[PDB]
């Protein structure tokens, strides 16, 4: 299996008195390990996975230092962006930041990234080469020249190829019991008559990690991307995920229909067929 | 672990 570390930051302006909202969360693959919330009492970076708790006070203090710099920078940013777009202080605006890194099965650097958005739309992003920027509009171009002068991309490449990669490895080792597991899907099928001459078949996948899964339905082994309701992969609450797919079927003809489950924890891909 | 250097837009 390959692996990722990702940090997601969301800052939101609240017009007038008091302060804006800031939420930061860290992920290793699809497992949240940290958070900071500005409305929380502690004003510290907090653990959200038992394997990170064992980190020392020097870790937690440093991460609390850095996340406050992230927080304060985002607040500064909100005013600047309001200034670039010539916007009033009355409106509520959202800033979002995402950065992190992926590794191969060899646990070497595969790619790094750093994406930034304003009101739910791409503003500026670092390219896969990590030396140059992709600006969305004229305001972002103004930031691009400033970040180019400040050698921001050099600093990010250093973190993304170096520090990011090393801490991911450590987290994968320290949290191996949870992070390096692969819970395969527990599958089954259900049958419900919808009319006189129609039935609904629903293919269920439960209790699986990681989240990436593929559920196809097939009629005579031909793909059926039409006539098929697919709910989004959703979280169970216990660190595993859930999904289902479904098809409307002319009753009598249930044995022609197959559901195909692909997943990391499945040695071979599964194939289900209804059986009374 | 978080990035250290964060530069304002």
């Amino acid at each position, epitope marked *: 299996g390959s692996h990722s570390m990702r940090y997601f930051f969301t800052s939101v302006s609240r017009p007038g008195r008091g*302060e804006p909202r800031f939420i930061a969360v860290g992920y290793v693959d699809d497992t949240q390990f940290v958070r900071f919330d*500005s409305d929380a009492a502690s*004003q510290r970076m907090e653990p959200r996975a038992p394997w990170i708790e064992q980190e020392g006070p*020097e870790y937690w*203090d*440093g*991460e*609390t*230092r*850095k996340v*406050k*710099a*992230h*927080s*304060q*920078t985002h*607040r*500064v940013d909100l*005013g600047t962006l309001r200034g670039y777009y010539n916007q009033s202080e009355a409106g509520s605006h959202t800033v979002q930041r995402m950065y992190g890194c992926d590794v191969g099965s060899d646990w070497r650097f595969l790619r790094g990234y750093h994406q930034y958005a304003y009101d739910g739309k791409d503003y500026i992003a670092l390219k896969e080469d990590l030396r140059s920027w992709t600006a969305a509009d004229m305001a972002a171009q103004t930031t691009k020249h400033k970040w180019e*002068a*400040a*050698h*921001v991309a*050099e*600093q990010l490449r*250093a973190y993304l190829e*170096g*520090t990011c990669v090393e801490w991911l490895r450590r987290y994968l080792e320290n949290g191996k019991e949870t992070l390096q597991r692969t819970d395969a899907p527990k599958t089954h099928m259900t049958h419900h008559a919808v009319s006189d001459h129609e039935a609904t078949l629903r293919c269920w996948a439960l209790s699986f990690y990681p989240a990436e899964i593929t559920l196809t339905w097939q009629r005579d082994g031909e793909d059926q991307t039409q006539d098929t309701e697919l709910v989004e992969t959703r979280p169970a609450g216990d660190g595993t995920f859930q999904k289902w797919a479904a098809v409307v079927v002319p009753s009598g003809q249930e044995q022609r229909y197959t559901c195909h489950v692909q997943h990391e924890g499945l040695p071979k891909p599964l194939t289900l067929r209804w059986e009374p | *672990s*978080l990035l*250290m*250097w*964060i*530069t*304002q837009v």
Partner: T-cell receptor
Amino acid sequence: SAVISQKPSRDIKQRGTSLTIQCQVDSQVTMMFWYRQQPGQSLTLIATANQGSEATYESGFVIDKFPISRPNLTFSTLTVSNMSPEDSSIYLCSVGGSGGADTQYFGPGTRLTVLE
Amino acid sequence: AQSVAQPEDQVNVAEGNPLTVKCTYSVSGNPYLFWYVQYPNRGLQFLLKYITGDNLVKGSYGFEAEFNKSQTSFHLKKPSALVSDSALYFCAVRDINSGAGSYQLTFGKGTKLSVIP
């Protein structure tokens, strides 16, 4: 260019009293620090003024003696409580971004003479 | 860790000669370097900084410094001194590889330059 007002500029007070120095900034800025220096001598960092929480103090400096408050990113105060002759020095409000290249600015200073 | 030594408290020069304010640095990772000046009854004013790229960095009033990796130095230089340049001069380093979240610059003790007319 970030300009830094400090008020008061000069103040003479006596053992046991407390002075509360202000630091205003013309725009909103990321990091804020409180430095303390003797004339013609090295800077000593007191603490780091975090927006919306207790300041992070340096070894030898405690919140009981050196209250710090930062309501805005533009405004902060350092109070120096139960003063004594040794606490006499220049108190500097420093400011700057959290970027790698970003420059760290200082302010006019506040001369504190503490007498018995 | 990170630190800078300014090994000279007082530096003297005649007006119009070369002035040299010396600074070395020690750093675990890679350095961004800084110079600051203080005239009486004021905060530290910014002079110049080596971010990256060109080792020779030019600033204001004919001030400069060269980034020398081998001697681990960033000495401030100016070809001909004026009297107004008599001040307290501070060197400062930033370990760009640090991940500990102490953002402040780490300064030296200070070298007092006296440009005698």
